[PDB]
Paper text:
[name] viruses are categorized by their surface glycoproteins including hemagglutinin (HA), which binds sialic acid receptors on the surface of a host cell and mediates fusion of the virus with the host endosomal membrane. While only the H1N1 and H3N2 [name] subtypes currently circulate in humans, the [name] influenza virus poses a distinct risk. A recent phase 1 clinical trial investigating a ferritin nanoparticle vaccine displaying H2 hemagglutinin (HA) in H2-naive and H2-exposed adults enabled us to perform comprehensive structural and biochemical characterization of immune memory on the breadth and diversity of the polyclonal serum antibody response elicited. The molecular details of cross-reactive and strain-specific monoclonal antibodies (mAbs) isolated from H2-F-vaccinated individuals were revealed by high-resolution cryoelectron microscopy (cryo-EM).
For H2-naive individuals, we observed through semi-quantitative nsEMPEM and serological analyses that the vast majority of H2-specific pAb responses targeted the conserved stem domain, and H1 cross-reactive [name] responses were also recalled. To assess epitopes targeted by cross-reactive and H2-specific head-binding antibodies, mAbs from B cells collected post-vaccination were isolated and characterized from six participants from blood collected 1 and 2 weeks after H2-F boost. nsEM epitope mapping revealed distinct patterns for each mAb group: H2-specific mAbs targeted a variety of epitopes on the HA head including [name], vestigial esterase, and antigenic sites Sa and Cb, while the majority of cross-reactive mAbs targeted the [name]. These cross-reactive [name] antibodies were detected in three subjects (1-1, 1-3, and 2-2), demonstrating that this broad antibody response is seen across individuals after H2 vaccination. As the [name] is functionally conserved, antibodies to this site have the potential to be broadly reactive. Moreover, multiple cross-reactive mAbs targeted the [name] with similar mechanisms to known [name]-targeting mAbs, suggesting that H2 vaccination offers a broad scope of protection by generating multiple modes of binding to the [name]. Moreover, H2 vaccination induced cross-reactive, neutralizing mAbs with diverse gene usages and mechanisms of binding, providing redundancy that may safeguard against viral escape mutations.
Numbering used by the authors:
A (entry chain H): 1 to 82, 82A, 82B, 82C, 83 to 100, 100A, 100B, 100C, ...
B (entry chain L): 1 to 105
C (entry chain C), F (entry chain G), H (entry chain A): 11 to 54, 54A, 55 to 83, 83A, 84 to 95, 95A, 96 to 125, 125A, ...
D (entry chain D): 9 to 171
E (entry chain I), G (entry chain B): 1 to 171
The structure:
């Protein structure tokens, strides 16, 4: 029921940091872990990492030196930042919410994502 | 990452008949696998999690099973809107990863 | 001319009882029995009790999310509990040695609540953010504010091993729990181990718990349970916690300055200060008489409860004027 | 000895009604009144002072498999309550009787004090009343009250009037 | 007793007096015999009846109290259960016996006082019209027929009426 | 002419004690101490005691085959047990919280016996007929009338799972047991597993049993043991039984209705057509006196027990004629 | 006591009387001195002795009794045992003090009546042959030698025998 | 000529209280309350006490190496323990039902210490020489005199299966324990298994123990623990021990003889050559008065304890001369 929409620059040069923000429409961060997933054209999905609004993060070690994920104070927004763009990052970025563990339990991981945005394509 | 691939990179099915896809992992993922649909310009949608259980809102048409490294993905019938890009996710390790995906047309 | 010898009489209908006769009027009387309270929960010696409001003892001590207003109530004279508290043990389970804990806490004059195993730094290998719908707080999922539910991280459930030395110079009460999931599927999804154990020891304390998998009747929407356990550390002792799953961690603990003369009262009376050296669940008693017929369960400097309507003594003369 | 009490007497407990040609009125005997008060005051205070107490809370909680212990706790409370109730009520009844008999003795003793002072100078009448054989003024009313009556002084008049 | 009437100034009681506890015997020209003082006797009865009933009626009913079974590792509890029963038995037995003894002693003083006061009632009525003699008797100095004896017993003796006769009989 | 003041004397021998004198004969006296009883077991306020006879409480409630005449005994005012019961736990074992159960059963004024888990339909894939010579009846091997011994069927022991909702609107006493074999050969022959367990839960009751294997001294010719367990299910709750072996299933259960004034006594006194306010183990008391010296253990509305031989108060005069 | 004899009508006791509690003092031409009334003293001794011993004798012997050890998770049982011990101690302390005070007061009344009753016994023997004077004394209206003093003490005084002399001395 | 009636007076200062007057000097009085003791521990009716010196009851009953001198103390009138025992359990652990054992040993007037499972014939294939620094004596490592530590021999730990029949016609107290090593390396080195169990049964006693391997705080420099367990074997019964490791075997057992009037006190009073019928922890009482205000804990035939300062009764006259 919560729905997501990515927004940010559609073009980032290699010397720059890419910064994309997801806005949650019809909802809020709500104790869940929120994730970023990437997809270079012609490829499958790549997991980047997630964040809990409390400040808890988990990143794919392969991007760990360049990626940070954070949250806003509006608590219906969160964002992805990738430093030192290498142009291997010419991909569609997606906003998604980690699936709830149970109707009566959250704040724990499930390993997969249930709502997704359409994604935004960034060119380098 | 546990590298996982899909052999039926593409399917070609003219009628609204049964179609199957598969995923094979280099390392066991137990039952910790998810199966998704993707379409251009559309949000990706989860079909199945835990190898065999459907997500809320997902038609009975989607099913599957498997364990360890070998997973079978079944579409009972393809409706015109199901000719999507499909992919598997492995969440039994860290980092989590996905297969390269397949195209159903 | 004459002298008459006699005694006074007056207008009085007080009567006393005797052994030989039941109704003797008197010119003067005293009453040894107190039959009235002021209706208020007064403060013994001016020191207020802990008012639990709508929470139970197992609500206050565990940090039940909704009885938050009392976490700062450090100084106690006694405990006041509502006849039917609703807030406590928000995640259902058995609270071990509850009656004994109630007695030990009742006598504590001062509670220093402190972090024993702080959330942010004590568990870098586990999820410390799990919350439940049952421990609802202002409509949001939450958990006891003295406990942490530790679940796996990145597909792993590393072994838990940590200890605390009691350097508080007070007895320290450490509370923790054990999770008993409704299904083996949750046991694996949450802890990644099918045969988990929880072990807690001290110089003299030693208990092993073995989480069981069973579907229990659903309570507060939970099918499983969290049992609660506790022990005290003497100054200088150490509590050691070890687990490979299902431990609900002892995030907070209480350093207890033990006292005496206090106790627990079940009452729905309002608070209003007076120096009620004696207090019953119905209100304060403020008298010096040796007996009361107000209530059998009292706290403070009370007249002895007796099952009697009146204890009137005669001090004057039999009151018969002519 | 008196028919009943005097509502006209308000300055003590026990006393005299003095009647003669120079006046009439009531006056209390402060000595017997104060002694009666002190005795009683000590008696009432003793009953109060002897209650032996310690002050703790007394209620106790038990679980559903602890009925044997809960019932013992109840047995202890019912037993102690029944002992104190029985004893408190009987003590009060005994204390009241001694006080009333104490008072009966005190008034009888004033009567006898007068009887001993007046001897043959007055006759006994029931209902507590001594009638003088000789004329008596306010000063002899006080002397009888104070135990300083000069009996022989009026003996001649009384012999003449003792018909 | 502390008044000294029972088997004291009165040599002993009357086995021939059956209509009460306290009473009179008289002898005159019209006959002799016994009659009880019904007001004195009934007052004594009512007083004591209330005393006996106070001791009984102030006692509460003993409600079911039975022993308890304990297992072999519960002797500390069994010993308390026994301690409580023995402590209560000790107190109640002690007070039950003590109360009976204290009241029996006081009851006898009560009765000793009542007969002594009956004797004094007569002395106040007769004054110089009779001599005090032992066994609780008064010897009249004038003829005292049945009407006189009833008047004396009732506290209605017309003292001056017989004073001329007694003055002469007294010498 | 003479008038004499005297007092009554008679032929009475009633003798009382005083504080100043040890033997005073009086004309009239009152006895405050009751020392008689009629030697019989009587009804209390019209309600008969339960007669267990040779059956211990465990023998009775477990359905010992020899306690069949105690099945129809739905209600009582008190319970009468022989001083040395012979028919108890015929299949040797530990009866958990037995003493506590006796304390709670005496309070039951009445109960309904009903079948909780029907023999013929509850377990179609298990043998529900295990028996033992140790519980034989009239020479035939048997078992408890209120319990079912569940062993495998056709080589299989499918997991057992049953539950019951307390729709009796009474607390329900549910009895069950856990079998503990002397060896492995017996454990496998009966339950087809070396890892049996029993698990019983209710909203708050939660216990798991682990059958143990050990050599034991023979009792009633058995080397193994059956431990007995019980719980009271609250109205509206659900009791759930799960096992993969060694379970002796509840068959019958009791719907209990509690009251007050009852207790359990041991006595060999006969029962008869009589009624009394107070019953002692030596026989019933029919008296209004405040004290008794008959017995310390009593049921009903009783005189208080004292060690006194006599409590005789004087009401009359000292009995000295002359 | 409440009868008013001890340090009342009798100004105070006799330190010169050493053979009893109650007694007489006399003076006449043939001698003087103090002597106890043995019948009164010995009855008083036995009465009190029975009372004092009854108080001691009815107290049961205290048999071995100890407290009990409890662990730190057995506080409710520890407190139940303490509650029982304190309740019994406070009851027995109360009853012990209460009984002693009630009995001490009654004992003094007992003695005060006995000396007063002894006084009245003599008053009844002497009648008009002696007059009452302060300090509980009877002054004779006739010469009373040592044999007379014994006769009065023995309750054998032949009143009319001395009446001619007393009638003259009475004026 | 005058005859006077009076009463006795003397130089007495005995003073009593009454209900109406605060201080009455009397000629004669009786003291009903005892306020002294002699400071000594005396014999009771000819029988000397058991003195444990610096040994706790656990120290003594287990055979602590320093309680050697107490082995010969076969009988006593009472048991005296020092206020701060130093020699208790020498190999740290939990002593099961310790307070309950003290309560039952308090009834023992005498015992026979006998070897129950002879060291030389009961275990030919186990090492029976284990000692510890924690149970050292006179510079040498040692162990409990009533217990035997059974470790393996030549790499093997053959199953232990032993029994004893109580033919002493006394209840027999059997003590044993279970070893809980600090880690696996020690568990393997000593017992050659990581899965040891201990099981002890009698006709009615049944308990199984599992060693719980864990790091624990050091106590008496030991990281592991040995727990102690006990049971009283009834005459005619059989006690059976089964184990495959971690058992501290019974070596000696006590054949007990129970009686009445004995008890356990804590006292640092000296013992001497004296005798009394009443004893308090501060010293013996030699008095026949009905009350005492010396101490609430007593042994023997004692005055009743009251909180009263004085209970002086008057037997004589008000002491008022003139
Ligand atoms: C803190 O205390 C409050 C009470 O003041 C607790 O709220 C109550 O929680 C119970 C949970 O069973 C609610 O009962 C259920 O309500 C739903 C409503 O749709 C009904 O469908 C169910 O059948 C059941 O009756 C109860 O209504 C609710 N009361 C209020 C006023 O909201 C609260 O849960 C306690 N929180 C914590 C953390 O302990
Ligand atoms: C019910 O009680 C009877 C009491 O007689 C038991 O019968 C005795 O059992 C013992 C067992 O050792 C035998 O030695 C006796 O010879 C038996 N006596 C008789 C008369 O048969 C009976 O076993 C008990 N039954 C149950 C099921 O508990
Ligand atoms: C018996 O009691 C003595 C009491 O002193 C024990 O001796 C102490 O043992 C500790 C062990 O850590 C040492 O640190 C102390 O220094 C020792 N005290 C002294 C004065 O030397 C002894 O160990 C106990 N023995 C047994 C077998 O329990
Ligand atoms: C009668 O009652 C009034 C009430 O005010 C009191 O003042 C008065 O003193 C009483 N009379 C006597 C004799 O005490
Ligand atoms: C004694 O007085 C009370 C006063 O309330 C009265 O109710 C009771 O009936 C009286 N009893 C008698 C015997 O007069
Ligand atoms: C208890 O709960 C009721 C219902 O939610 C609420 O109205 C009341 O104010 C609460 N009282 C306290 C002391 O929290
Ligand atoms: C988890 O524990 C391992 C050792 O078992 C350690 O090397 C690792 O750094 C820990 N991870 C975190 C996040 O602290
Ligand atoms: C946790 O303990 C098990 C043994 O129970 C061991 O095999 C495993 O390697 C341990 N894991 C960590 C992170 O130390
Ligand atoms: C007195 O004698 C009568 C018969 O005259 C007899 O009935 C009664 O029992 C006797 N009472 C006694 C002995 O006290
Ligand atoms: C009192 O009389 C009874 C009669 O049986 C006798 O046994 C007892 O010894 C007597 N007691 C005294 C003190 O004389
Ligand atoms: C019960 O006990 C009696 C002896 O008191 C015995 O005769 C009888 O046979 C026993 N059994 C039954 C069923 O009555
Ligand atoms: C008995 O076996 C059948 C086999 O199909 C199964 O469906 C049924 O649930 C089993 N019932 C039990 C164990 O009660
Ligand atoms: C009285 O004096 C005597 C010596 O004449 C002495 O022995 C005794 O102690 C004294 N008694 C008191 C209580 O003064
Ligand atoms: C009574 O005498 C004691 C000393 O025996 C003394 O301490 C006390 O103050 C006196 N007065 C009162 C009222 O007790
Ligand atoms: C107790 O310790 C002291 C030293 O503090 C020693 O002298 C004494 O002998 C010890 N007693 C025993 C029984 O070991
Ligand atoms: C010890 O080993 C021998 C080897 O032949 C065996 O016969 C004996 O039964 C064993 N005894 C034990 C373990 O007690």
């Amino acid at each position: 029921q919560v729905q997501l929409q990515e927004s940010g620059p559609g073009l980032v040069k290699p010397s720059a940091t890419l910064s994309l923000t997801c806005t949650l429409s019809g909802g809020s961060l709500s104790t869940h872990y929120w994730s970023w997933i990437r997809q270079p054209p012609g490829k499958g999905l790549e997991y980047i990492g997630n964040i809990h609004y409390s400040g808890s993060t988990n990143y794919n070690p392969s991007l760990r030196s360049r990626v940070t994920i954070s949250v806003g104070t509006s608590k219906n927004q969160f964002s992805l930042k990738l430093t030192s763009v290498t142009a291997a990052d010419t991909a569609v970025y997606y906003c998604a919410r980690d699936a709830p563990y149970s109707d009566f339990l959250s704040g724990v991981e499930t390993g997969w994502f249930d709502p997704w945005g359409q994604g935004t394509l960034v060119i380098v | 990452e546990i590298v996982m691939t899909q052999s039926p990179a593409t399917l070609s099915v003219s009628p609204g008949e049964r179609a199957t896809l598969s995923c094979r992992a280099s390392q066991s993922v137990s039952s910790n696998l998810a199966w998704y649909q993707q379409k251009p310009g559309q949000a990706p949608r989860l079909l199945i999690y835990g190898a065999s259980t459907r997500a809320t809102g997902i038609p009975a048409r989607f099913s599957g099973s498997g364990s360890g490294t070998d997973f079978t993905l079944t579409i009972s019938s393809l409706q015109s809107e199901d000719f999507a890009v499909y992919s598997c996710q492995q969440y039994n390790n860290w980092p989590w990863t996905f297969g390269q995906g397949t195209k159903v047309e | 001319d004459t002298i008459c010898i006699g005694y006074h009489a007056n207008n009085s209908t007080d009567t006393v009882d005797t052994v030989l006769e039941k109704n003797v009027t008197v010119t003067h009387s005293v009453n040894l029995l107190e039959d009235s309270h002021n209706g208020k929960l007064c403060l013994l010696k001016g020191i207020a009790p802990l008012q639990l409001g709508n929470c139970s003892v197992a609500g206050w001590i565990l940090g039940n999310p909704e009885c938050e207003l009392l976490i700062s109530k450090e100084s106690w004279s006694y405990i006041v509990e509502t006849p039917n508290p609703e807030n406590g043990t928000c995640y259902p389970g058995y609270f071990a040695d509850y009656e004994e804990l109630r007695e030990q806490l009742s006598s504590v004059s001062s509670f220093e609540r402190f972090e024993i195993f702080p959330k942010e730094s004590s568990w870098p290998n586990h999820t410390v953010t799990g919350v439940s719908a049952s421990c609802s707080h202002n409509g949001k999922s939450s958990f006891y504010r003295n406990l942490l539910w530790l679940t796996g991280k990145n597909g792993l459930y590393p072994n838990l091993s940590k200890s605390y030395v009691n350097n508080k110079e007070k007895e320290v009460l450490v509370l923790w729990g054990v999770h008993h999931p409704p299904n083996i599927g949750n046991q694996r999804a949450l802890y990644h181990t099918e045969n988990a154990y929880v072990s807690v020891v001290s110089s003299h304390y030693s208990r092993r718990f073995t989480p069981e998998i069973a579907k229990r009747p659903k309570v507060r929407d939970q099918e499983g349970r969290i049992n609660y356990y506790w022990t005290l550390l003497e100054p200088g002792d150490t509590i050691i916690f070890e687990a490979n799953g299902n431990l609900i961690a002892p995030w907070y603990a209480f350093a207890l300055s033990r006292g005496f003369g206090s106790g627990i009262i079940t009452s729905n009376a309002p608070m209003d200060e007076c120096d009620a050296k004696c207090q019953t669940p119905q209100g304060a008693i403020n008298s010096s008489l040796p007996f009361q017929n107000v209530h059998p369960v009292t706290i403070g400097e009370c007249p002895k409860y007796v099952r009697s309507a009146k204890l009137r003594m005669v001090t004057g003369l039999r009151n018969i004027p002519s | 000895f008196i028919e009943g009490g005097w509502t006209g007497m308000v300055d003590g407990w026990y006393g005299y009604h003095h009647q003669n040609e120079q006046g009439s009125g009531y006056a209390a005997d402060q000595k017997s009144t104060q002694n009666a008060i002190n005795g009683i005051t000590n008696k009432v205070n003793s009953v109060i002072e002897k209650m032996n107490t310690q002050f703790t809370a007394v209620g106790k909680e038990f679980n559903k498999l602890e009925r044997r212990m809960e019932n013992l706790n109840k047995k202890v409370d019912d037993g102690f309550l029944d002992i104190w109730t029985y004893n408190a009520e009987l003590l009060v009844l005994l204390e009241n009787e001694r006080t009333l008999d104490f008072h009966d003795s005190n008034v009888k003793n004033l009567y006898e004090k007068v009887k001993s002072q007046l001897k043959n100078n007055a006759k006994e009448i029931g209902n507590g009343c001594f009638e003088f054989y000789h004329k008596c003024n306010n000063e002899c009313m006080e002397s009888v009250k104070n135990g300083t009556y000069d009996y022989p002084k009026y003996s001649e008049e009384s012999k003449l009037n003792r018909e």
